[PDB]
Amino acid sequence: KDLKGTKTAENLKQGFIGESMANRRYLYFAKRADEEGYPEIAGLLRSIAEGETAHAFGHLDFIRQGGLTDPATDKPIGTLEQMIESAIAGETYEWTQMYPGFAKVAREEGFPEVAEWFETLARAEKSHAEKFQNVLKQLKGG
Amino acid sequence: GHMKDLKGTKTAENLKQGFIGESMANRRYLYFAKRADEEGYPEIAGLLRSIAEGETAHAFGHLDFIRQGGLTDPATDKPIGTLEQMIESAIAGETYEWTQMYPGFAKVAREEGFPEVAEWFETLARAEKSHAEKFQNVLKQLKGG
Ligand SMILES: [Cl-]
Ligand SMILES: [Cl-]
Ligand code: NI
Ligand code: NI
Ligand code: NI
Ligand code: NI
Ligand code: NI
Numbered sequence: 001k002d003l004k005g006t007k008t009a010e011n012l013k014q015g016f017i018g019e020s021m022a023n024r025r026y027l028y029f030a031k032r033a034d035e036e037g038y039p040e041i042a043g044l045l046r047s048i049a050e051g052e053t054a055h056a057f058g059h060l061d062f063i064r065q066g067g068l069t070d071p072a073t074d075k076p077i078g079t080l081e082q083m084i085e086s087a088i089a090g091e092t093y094e095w096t097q098m099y100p101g102f103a104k105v106a107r108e109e110g111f112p113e114v115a116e117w118f119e120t121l122a123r124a125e126k127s128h129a130e131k132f133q134n135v136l137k138q139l140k141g142g
Numbered sequence: 143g144h145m146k147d148l149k150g151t152k153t154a155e156n157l158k159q160g161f162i163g164e165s166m167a168n169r170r171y172l173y174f175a176k177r178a179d180e181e182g183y184p185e186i187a188g189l190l191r192s193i194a195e196g197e198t199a200h201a202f203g204h205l206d207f208i209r210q211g212g213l214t215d216p217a218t219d220k221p222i223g224t225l226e227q228m229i230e231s232a233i234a235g236e237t238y239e240w241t242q243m244y245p246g247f248a249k250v251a252r253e254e255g256f257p258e259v260a261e262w263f264e265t266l267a268r269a270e271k272s273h274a275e276k277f278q279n280v281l282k283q284l285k286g287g
Contacts, residue, residue: 001255001256003256003259006254006256007250007254008247008250008251008254008256008259011247011250011251011263012259015243015244015247015263015266016166016169017162017165017166018217018235018239018243019169020162020165020166020168020169021161021162021165021216021217022217022235023165023168023169024161024164024165024168024198024201024202024205025205025215025217025222025228025231025232025235026232027198028201028202028205029222029225029228029229029232032225032228033225036225038225038284040280041225041229041280041283041284044276044277044280045232048273048276048277051269051273053169053172055266055269056169056173057169057173058262058266060169060170060173062259062262070170071166072163072166072167072170077170077174080174080177080178080181080183080186083174083177084174084186086170087170087171087174087190090163090167090170094163098160098163099160102153102156102160105152105153105156106153106156109151109152109153110146111146111148111151111153112143113143113144113146114148114153114157114207114211117203117207118156118160121160121200121203124196124200128193128196131189131193132189132193135186135189138186139186
C-alpha cells in the first residue's frame, strides 16, 4: 500500500538521516583510534560502519520502492537520471544559498576561520554541480 | 583561533546542519553509484564515488570545528573530545535506537499496514542492540587500561 503521507514515510526519512550520521561519526572516531594505537577498536568502528551503510541503503530502498522522494532534496530518485537531478538540486542549494549564508553568519558572529571554511565548501559544491550537470547532459542526450 | 568558543551561536547550529547534509550526500552518492554500476555507466559511477570522498572531507571538517569549538556530537548531544567520549557517544546513539527509536518505528509501521517495513525496523533494532553491546565491551578496555 502507498507510503505517501504516512508516519512510516517520515520515519524512513529520519532513519536515513541518523544512519547517514552514524557511518560518518564512526569512521571519524576510527581515525582517532588509529592514531592512538587501538586497531581492534578502529576495526570494530569500521565494521559497524558497514552495518550502518546497509541500514541507510535499506531505508532508501523502501523510500524509492515506495515512490517517496530523496530525504535530502525532496526530489524523486527512481531512475538514474532522477538520481543525478537530485544530486544537482542539492549541490545547487548548497553553493547558491546554504553555504554562502552560513559563511555570512560566521563572519558576522566573529568566526572568520569557520567562515573561510564555509566559503571553500560553497566553491566545492559549485564544482560538484557543474560535473553532475555534464553527466545529466550525457544521459538526457543519449 | 581554532579553539574559539562556539556555544550558543547561530554558527554552532549551522555546523550541525552542515554535518547532517554532508553525511546524507555521501550516502546518497554511493547509493546512486550502484545504479550506475548495474546499468553500465562506469564514468558516472566513478564521479559519484569521487565526489562522495569530497563529502566525507566536508563532514569530517565540520566535526573538527564542532569539537574544537566546544560543541557536542550532532547525533547524540554528547561530547566527543576524547576517544572514550567518542565511544560513549556511539553507545548513547545505539541505545536510543534499540530501546526506543526503531521499536517505535516498527509499531507504527505495523499499525499503518506496512508489515514488511515493520520487520525491517525490528531487524535494525536488534542490530543496534548488538552494536551497543560490542561498543560497551571495548569501552571497558579503555577505562581499565
Ligand atoms: Cl585495540
Ligand atoms: Cl559512464
Ligand atoms: Ni544502524
Ligand atoms: Ni557536493
Ligand atoms: Ni586557531
Ligand atoms: Ni559537501
Ligand atoms: Ni548501530
